[PDB]
Ligand binder design. Structure first.
Ligand SMILES: CCc1ccc(-c2[nH]nc3nc(-c4ccc(C(=O)O)cc4)cc(C(=O)O)c23)cc1
Ligand SMILES: CCc1ccc(-c2[nH]nc3nc(-c4ccc(C(=O)O)cc4)cc(C(=O)O)c23)cc1
Ligand SMILES: [Cl-]
Lengths: 242, 242
């Protein structure tokens, strides 16, 4: 059961931006969004795809554990934090694309397509380069589809080991305090118009979990901070966090 | 290998308190404390014992997972947060002794004694009520010994399943942001002199981990927040956290 709350649109325009936030009250099985139509519009997952991609690599053995070090290849890229060694935790934290492209090549389109299909993920379509399809290929997913996927991950229901799921949820850790825990993943889709930013994940409270999926128009990298900032405004307005 | 830095004692005497903080740089395998002597004085672990107790309960089956509920027994106790239902995550967060006391009774002295010996935990001695020995019984552990145990937990080297260890580390989650992650457990030892507060755990950074164990004289519960505050002041001084 879904409910539209366009009042949330205030938080978008206050920064003269456009997008959608989707929330899902797990206890109540109820959903809320500012825009039912955009909530179902499909986009490239971009770096939010690091979630199923991590799940896959772990379960296959491409990645042995969250400590395994993936050494920098020496290629200087535009994001400083990519130019260094990473493990699964920091690779997901800094959205280190080259580390995940390498995982993809080792996974291979055969097992990749199989797994996504098992995950019922987006349009399950891996068409394009096997190491760049989630950034410029044919995979597509909507905010509402993000929340469907994440809810399986949360419940360890995905067709992978509990371990792989446990590890990926550890790597999604973004913020934690005495009031709440956020496990989430950012995304920035730049290669194909429209350019959008993603933030998807959930908020753990003592007695409930709120799943969320947001995306917003992101013409320039400068507004990337708004992904978290606007979601939190929505979270604060609905009294989910202080 | 160990350095004493009594400059840290300022952070204690800025709150008219005394105690010890012990830090361990895992990369360099070097330790730091303001008080070498008190670092090696053993006390009741009190609710810090929730770390091994959880690992044991999990590994035998007293606790199925972190989602399983343990309902309030209707007995109204001094701590408001105890008088409600709990899972492993919230019982840790709020130090709900009754839930762990019930764990202990189900655990039984035979299996308890065994595990603590396998853990090399403190003096490995559970003399007293099987459901209260960590609060008023014979078990003792020092700050340095806390750190020894915690490093085994961090590296998954304890003699329980990886799963048990991953779950307890999830339940230890205390604080996280873009700069650091803190997994820790608080303790208040009130039943036996001297009354002391505990805070033990570690700070995960991108490319290092700092283990810590601190304890301080705690006459009344009013000074309890100083356990985290003084630790963070020391972490700040050492440039571990901002
Ligand atoms: C194929 C040529 C080419 C070369 C470089 C880029 C590129 N520049 N800056 C990029 N930033 C991200 C990114 C940013 C934030 C987040 C975030 O989540 O905050 C993620 C990715 C990604 C890419 C990318 O390679 O797709 C970026 C794009 C295309
Ligand atoms: C058997 C008689 C009796 C009854 C009740 C208590 C008792 N009152 N308040 C207590 N608070 C804690 C506690 C506080 C903070 C933290 C913390 O970590 O922040 C933990 C425990 C513990 C006990 C206890 O039962 O030992 C407390 C003590 C003795
Ligand atoms: Cl975690």
């Amino acid at each position: 059961e879904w409910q539209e709350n366009k009042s949330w649109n205030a938080h978008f325009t206050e920064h003269k931006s456009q997008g959608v936030v989707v929330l899902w009250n797990e206890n109540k099985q109820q959903g809320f969004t500012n825009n039912l139509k955009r909530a179902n519009q499909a986009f490239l997952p971009a770096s939010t795809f690091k979630i199923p991609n991590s799940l896959i690599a772990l379960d296959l053995g491409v990645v042995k554990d969250e400590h395994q070090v993936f050494k920098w290849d020496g290629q200087t890229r535009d994001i400083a934090t990519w130019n260094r060694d990473h493990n699964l935790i920091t690779a997901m934290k800094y959205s280190v694309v080259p580390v995940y492209q390498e995982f993809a090549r080792q996974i291979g389109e055969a097992r990749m397509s199989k797994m996504l299909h098992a995950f019922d993920y987006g349009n399950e379509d891996i068409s394009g380069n096997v190491d760049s399809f989630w950034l410029d290929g044919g995979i597509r997913i909507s905010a509402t589809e993000q929340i469907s996927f994440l809810r399986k991950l949360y419940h360890n229901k995905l067709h992978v080991s509990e371990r792989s799921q446990r590890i990926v949820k550890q790597a999604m850790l973004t913020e934690a305090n005495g009031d709440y825990i956020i496990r989430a993943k950012t995304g920035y889709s730049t290669r194909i118009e429209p350019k959008i930013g993603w933030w998807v994940g959930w908020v753990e409270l003592d007695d409930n979990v709120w799943f969320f999926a947001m995306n917003m128009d992101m013409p320039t990298s400068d507004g990337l901070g708004l992904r978290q900032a606007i979601t939190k405004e929505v979270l604060k307005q609905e009294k989910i966090i202080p």
